[PDB]
Design an enzyme around this catalytic site. Structure first.
Site, PDB file in Angstrom:
ATOM      1  N   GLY A  22      -4.125   1.811   2.748  1.00 12.50           N
ATOM      2  CA  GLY A  22      -4.145   3.272   2.880  1.00 12.50           C
ATOM      3  C   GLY A  22      -4.890   3.981   1.755  1.00 12.50           C
ATOM      4  O   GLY A  22      -5.308   3.349   0.779  1.00 12.50           O
ATOM      5  N   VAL A  24      -4.812   7.150  -1.136  1.00 13.51           N
ATOM      6  CA  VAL A  24      -3.827   7.881  -1.942  1.00 13.51           C
ATOM      7  C   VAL A  24      -4.379   9.192  -2.529  1.00 13.51           C
ATOM      8  O   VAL A  24      -5.341   9.193  -3.309  1.00 13.51           O
ATOM      9  CB  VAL A  24      -3.230   6.981  -3.055  1.00 13.51           C
ATOM     10  N   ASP A 129       4.081  -8.059  -3.853  1.00 11.40           N
ATOM     11  CA  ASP A 129       2.832  -7.714  -4.517  1.00 11.40           C
ATOM     12  C   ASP A 129       3.063  -7.060  -5.876  1.00 11.40           C
ATOM     13  O   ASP A 129       2.618  -5.937  -6.127  1.00 11.40           O
ATOM     14  CB  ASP A 129       1.974  -6.813  -3.621  1.00 11.40           C
TER      15      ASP A 129
HETATM   16  C1  LIG Z   1       8.244   4.411  -3.413  1.00 12.77           C
HETATM   17  C2  LIG Z   1       7.991   3.586  -2.150  1.00 12.77           C
HETATM   18  C3  LIG Z   1       7.079   2.379  -2.406  1.00 12.77           C
HETATM   19  S1  LIG Z   1       5.488   2.453  -1.473  1.00 12.77           S
HETATM   20  O1  LIG Z   1       5.521   3.512  -0.455  1.00 12.77           O
HETATM   21  O2  LIG Z   1       5.093   1.088  -1.112  1.00 12.77           O
HETATM   22  N1  LIG Z   1       4.347   2.900  -2.681  1.00 12.77           N
HETATM   23  C4  LIG Z   1       3.595   3.995  -2.829  1.00 12.77           C
HETATM   24  C5  LIG Z   1       3.694   5.087  -1.941  1.00 12.77           C
HETATM   25  C6  LIG Z   1       2.875   6.217  -2.154  1.00 12.77           C
HETATM   26  C7  LIG Z   1       1.968   6.243  -3.242  1.00 12.77           C
HETATM   27  F1  LIG Z   1       1.191   7.334  -3.426  1.00 12.77           F
HETATM   28  C8  LIG Z   1       1.871   5.149  -4.138  1.00 12.77           C
HETATM   29  N2  LIG Z   1       1.002   5.154  -5.191  1.00 12.77           N
HETATM   30  C9  LIG Z   1      -0.167   4.278  -5.043  1.00 12.77           C
HETATM   31  C10 LIG Z   1       0.981   6.063  -6.208  1.00 12.77           C
HETATM   32  C11 LIG Z   1       2.100   6.901  -6.441  1.00 12.77           C
HETATM   33  C12 LIG Z   1       2.088   7.849  -7.491  1.00 12.77           C
HETATM   34  C13 LIG Z   1       0.953   7.970  -8.324  1.00 12.77           C
HETATM   35  N3  LIG Z   1       0.938   8.914  -9.371  1.00 12.77           N
HETATM   36  C14 LIG Z   1      -0.114   9.015 -10.135  1.00 12.77           C
HETATM   37  N4  LIG Z   1      -1.260   8.248  -9.998  1.00 12.77           N
HETATM   38  C15 LIG Z   1      -2.371   8.474 -10.934  1.00 12.77           C
HETATM   39  C16 LIG Z   1      -1.372   7.281  -9.006  1.00 12.77           C
HETATM   40  O3  LIG Z   1      -2.367   6.573  -8.847  1.00 12.77           O
HETATM   41  C17 LIG Z   1      -0.170   7.137  -8.103  1.00 12.77           C
HETATM   42  C18 LIG Z   1      -0.152   6.190  -7.050  1.00 12.77           C
HETATM   43  C19 LIG Z   1       2.696   4.023  -3.916  1.00 12.77           C
HETATM   44  F2  LIG Z   1       2.629   2.959  -4.750  1.00 12.77           F
END
Ligand SMILES: CCCS(=O)(=O)Nc1ccc(F)c(N(C)c2ccc3ncn(C)c(=O)c3c2)c1F
Length: 267
Positions: A22, A24, A129
């Protein structure tokens, strides 16, 4: 009863994420959020029921070290919304911005990640992962684990970038379901290696397939000697325990966790 965030409530903004699984975006829904819009055609069940089933996995998680699932979107498209983290990921800190952490902080990141993992395993969730890319360092003080969601979405609608964290039994795509608690532990051993050496493993091999073949057949494993000489004498052994070639020989996180807190009271 439902965490479905209805159409038009979220405000998708600046794009940051990429790759498969996906895309982000940074968003705004009751403050700065993260939205992971898994770009998939336009379902239509099973897919709808499959997405909602994977979401139900995320709902089982409530922990300071597990990324905060805030809600999911189906309407404008399929997406998961979580908290936004201030600061960078562990991979970025270690291998891009080259951030040099104090030894106590390094041990702490480790402690916390192990903590978050112990929780998931208790709630019967296998991450599948764990890598430093997925360990977010919030306000540069709190460890948040993410990307454990889905994986059924990964199989029902379908593996070339997490090589370094993959345990032998995983690397060699052998029996139908290689993923275990211990599989996550080896992955943790790798992030431990990352922390303790500030390096990715196998940097002196330029052939990815060779890594794959050897790791999977256990001819090549991480070079534990590279840990900085101010590393605790017993951190090296815990790392070695987590990285055992046979999965039966690996500790579980309750035990792993105890060893970190034990060596924590030694600085
Ligand atoms: C909690 C359920 C597990 S899941 O649904 O499997 N993982 C999940 C879901 C949605 C996202 F946007 C992110 N990331 C990828 C994410 C989230 C916050 C972030 N905040 C800041 N930055 C800079 C990021 O890159 C970032 C990336 C995740 F890793």
């Amino acid at each position: 009863d439902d965490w479905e965030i209805p159409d038009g409530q979220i405000t998708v903004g600046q794009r940051i994420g990429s790759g498969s699984f996906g895309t982000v975006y940074k968003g705004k829904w009751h403050g700065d959020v993260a939205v992971k819009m898994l770009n998939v055609t336009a379902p239509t069940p099973q897919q709808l029921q499959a997405f909602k089933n994977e979401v139900g996995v995320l709902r089982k998680t409530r922990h300071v070290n597990i990324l905060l699932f805030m809600g999911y979107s189906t309407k404008p498209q399929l997406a998961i919304v979580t908290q936004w983290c201030e600061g960078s990921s562990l991979y970025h800190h270690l291998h891009i911005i080259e951030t040099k952490f104090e030894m106590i902080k390094l041990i702490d990141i480790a402690r916390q990640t192990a903590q978050g993992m112990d929780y998931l395993h208790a709630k019967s969730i296998i991450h599948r992962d764990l890598k430093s890319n997925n360990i977010f360092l919030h306000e540069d003080l709190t460890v948040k684990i993410g990307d454990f969601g889905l994986a059924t979405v990964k199989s029902r609608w379908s593996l070339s970038g997490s090589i370094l964290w993959m345990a032998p039994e995983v690397i060699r795509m052998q029996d139908k379901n290689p993923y275990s608690f211990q599989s996550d532990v080896y992955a943790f051993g790798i992030v431990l290696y990352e922390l303790m050496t500030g390096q990715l493993p196998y940097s002196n091999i330029n052939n990815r397939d060779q890594i794959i073949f050897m790791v999977g057949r256990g001819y090549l494993s991480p070079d534990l000697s590279k840990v900085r000489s101010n590393c605790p004498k017993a951190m090296k052994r815990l790392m070695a325990e987590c990285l055992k070639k046979k999965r039966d020989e690996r500790p579980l996180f309750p035990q792993i966790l105890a060893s970190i807190e034990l060596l924590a009271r030694s600085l």
